[PDB]
Design a protein around this ligand. Sequence first.
Ligand SMILES: Cc1cc2nc3c(=O)[nH]c(=O)nc-3n(C[C@H](O)[C@H](O)[C@H](O)COP(=O)(O)OP(=O)(O)OC[C@H]3O[C@@H](n4cnc5c(N)ncnc54)[C@H](O)[C@@H]3O)c2cc1C
Ligand SMILES: *[C@@H]1O[C@H](CO)[C@@H](O)[C@H](O)[C@H]1NC(C)=O
Ligand SMILES: *[C@@H]1O[C@H](CO)[C@@H](O)[C@H](O)[C@H]1NC(C)=O
Ligand SMILES: *[C@@H]1O[C@H](CO)[C@@H](O)[C@H](O)[C@H]1NC(C)=O
Ligand SMILES: *[C@@H]1O[C@H](CO)[C@@H](O)[C@H](O)[C@H]1NC(C)=O
Ligand SMILES: *[C@@H]1O[C@H](CO)[C@@H](O)[C@H](O)[C@H]1NC(C)=O
Ligand SMILES: *[C@@H]1O[C@H](CO)[C@@H](O)[C@H](O)[C@H]1NC(C)=O
Ligand SMILES: *[C@@H]1O[C@H](CO)[C@@H](O)[C@H](O)[C@H]1NC(C)=O
Ligand SMILES: *[C@@H]1O[C@H](CO)[C@@H](O)[C@H](O)[C@H]1NC(C)=O
Ligand SMILES: CC1(C)OCc2cc(C=O)ccc2O1
Length: 514
Amino acid sequence: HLANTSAHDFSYLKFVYNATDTSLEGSYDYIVIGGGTSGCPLAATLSEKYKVLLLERGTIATEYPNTLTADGFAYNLQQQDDGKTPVERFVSEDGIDNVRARILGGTTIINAGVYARANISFYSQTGIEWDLDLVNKTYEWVEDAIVVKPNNQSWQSVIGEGFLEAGILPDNGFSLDHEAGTRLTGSTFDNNGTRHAADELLNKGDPNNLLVAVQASVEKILFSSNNLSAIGVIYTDSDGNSHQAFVRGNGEVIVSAGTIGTPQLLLLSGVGPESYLSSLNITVVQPNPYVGQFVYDNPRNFINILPPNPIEASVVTVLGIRSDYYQVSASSLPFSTPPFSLFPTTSYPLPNSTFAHIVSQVPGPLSHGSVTLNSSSDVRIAPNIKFNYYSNSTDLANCVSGMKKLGDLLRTKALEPYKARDVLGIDGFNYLGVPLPDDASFETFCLDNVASYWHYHGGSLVGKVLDDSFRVMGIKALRVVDASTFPYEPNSHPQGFYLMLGRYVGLQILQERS
Ligand SMILES: Cc1cc2nc3c(=O)[nH]c(=O)nc-3n(C[C@H](O)[C@H](O)[C@H](O)COP(=O)(O)OP(=O)(O)OC[C@H]3O[C@@H](n4cnc5c(N)ncnc54)[C@H](O)[C@@H]3O)c2cc1C
Ligand SMILES: *[C@@H]1O[C@H](CO)[C@@H](O)[C@H](O)[C@H]1NC(C)=O
Ligand SMILES: *[C@@H]1O[C@H](CO)[C@@H](O)[C@H](O)[C@H]1NC(C)=O
Ligand SMILES: *[C@@H]1O[C@H](CO)[C@@H](O)[C@H](O)[C@H]1NC(C)=O
Ligand SMILES: *[C@@H]1O[C@H](CO)[C@@H](O)[C@H](O)[C@H]1NC(C)=O
Ligand SMILES: *[C@@H]1O[C@H](CO)[C@@H](O)[C@H](O)[C@H]1NC(C)=O
Ligand SMILES: *[C@@H]1O[C@H](CO)[C@@H](O)[C@H](O)[C@H]1NC(C)=O
Ligand SMILES: *[C@@H]1O[C@H](CO)[C@@H](O)[C@H](O)[C@H]1NC(C)=O
Ligand SMILES: *[C@@H]1O[C@H](CO)[C@@H](O)[C@H](O)[C@H]1NC(C)=O
Ligand SMILES: CC1(C)OCc2cc(C=O)ccc2O1
């Protein structure tokens, strides 16, 4: 149930149109906002039976060829953000550099390619009445299209031997499942280095029913006057002109604009906390105190070693999983322009030689913050976001445990060949940045050297904004499907879950209607 090596399939471009085209305006059965990780499979799925309009603010990935290879991963983060690029830069109010996607295919067009299924306990933990058999068939539908078993990479094999030696057991071999132990997982880079992404799932939609508008910046959700319902959207094109599209009958608008874009759009449309919106003189359409609340970013903490002999660059494929920390490492060429957000600030030393980035992820996390509007009218102006890293002490204690484990990993035989000096301790490695340092000093290391893992989620939670069917409570014909919906990560690497979730919810909408 896995995909082959092949070129990125752009056949779907035959139904992709510039949002300047006013013939796109009119009535549809479904409008999907955000052509990303969840939105692309969701729109393709709905188009099997119904007329779908998919609206995406970014352009097409062919415009930026470095999004199409493993080799280009760094380039897209190094590229300056001119407002059109696939990578949009931002800084949380915590002061931590970060990025989100602005491109058809969403974050699967810019990410590190790691594919994994949700922790199988995640479903009962949510309390949603999942159709579990359907979930697994949907995973296979995604995997058959874009996931492969990766080939060996020498550094990934080193790191896998070290995880095992350091006691991250058992050895799970090759597996897509999020389970304790060390494993090789799937990748959306194929064995030729070609990137596969959510946009390619548009190829599974019906070309007679699915229309895609790019450089369509959705500014407002439109509602009925009465029985409050969503009825359509306002979006502007790359020239600045405005356009309207509607749903009809028993159809629906679904927001799939991401952790950041979905709460932003809901607020701008008057769905959010009564007090906050009134203070901005935004008319309240549906008061809900949780829109933009419970927004999470799992911490990344890391060390960099500079081996005395060169190592080969590699994409992450080998995972070391415990309940309280998830670990990986990438080996990378040197660079003199930093990939934005790889390190938490722009003033961070640059590597002269090949290096290994060795990393630990805090699960959850338990610390949370919020998304608030910067402009009360302009969707192209980025919202304020704060994550409050390490405000919850359980997160800190887990970073401490993870950092001690990376210490054990640096002490393994597998890693010994990468020390500069053949001494007994780990100060035999050459480090880029702060090395590992008791308890109080690991806490200070965790707090001072944290970065984003880029796996941020929340802001429109099931049980706070949405019901168990992803419907916005109080409003008919409006749903939200993307990473804004859950308060905890489904696994170490969540694109698999959100690719699946797009199609799954699409199938649930088709079922309800039928
Ligand atoms: C650099 C990076 C590396 C990552 N690496 C990995 C990894 O290796 N493995 C992994 O599993 N996960 C990884 N992730 C995380 C994972 O890819 C994301 O969590 C997930 O893809 C986000 O899903 P989404 O649908 O919520 O968002 P997106 O995929 O970003 O979808 C949102 C889309 O909506 C569009 N949009 C937003 N606002 C509007 C609007 N107003 N009008 C129209 N369109 C709009 C956006 O441009 C975007 O295309 C990575 C994340 C980043 C940032
Ligand atoms: C591998 O990638 C190269 C470079 O992008 C491409 O020219 C070639 O056709 C690919 N191989 C296969 C078998 O698709
Ligand atoms: C859409 O058309 C405008 C010209 O009106 C152009 O500047 C823009 O690049 C086009 N976008 C795409 C994705 O073709
Ligand atoms: C779904 O697949 C997982 C493996 O990813 C397996 O553990 C589980 O038993 C399957 N569930 C069902 C309902 O078949
Ligand atoms: C990688 O594992 C492969 C499995 O395809 C096997 O052929 C071989 O033992 C390994 N190859 C290298 C180059 O180490
Ligand atoms: C909202 O409008 C009132 C006038 O109706 C004004 O007094 C108040 O300052 C406005 N607040 C903002 C934030 O625009
Ligand atoms: C999987 O999820 C369950 C329940 O949420 C949790 O107890 C367990 O720690 C998780 N397993 C891993 C390997 O993260
Ligand atoms: C908008 O963003 C700017 C610059 O990022 C920030 O300094 C400012 O406080 C924000 N304004 C509001 C009203 O949130
Ligand atoms: C951390 O989060 C837990 C679980 O959500 C919560 O009960 C607790 O209040 C938080 N602890 C601190 C110290 O903030
Ligand atoms: C774990 C992580 C973040 O994954 C991807 C990655 C890529 C580069 C390329 O420059 C460098 C380091 C790195 O580490």
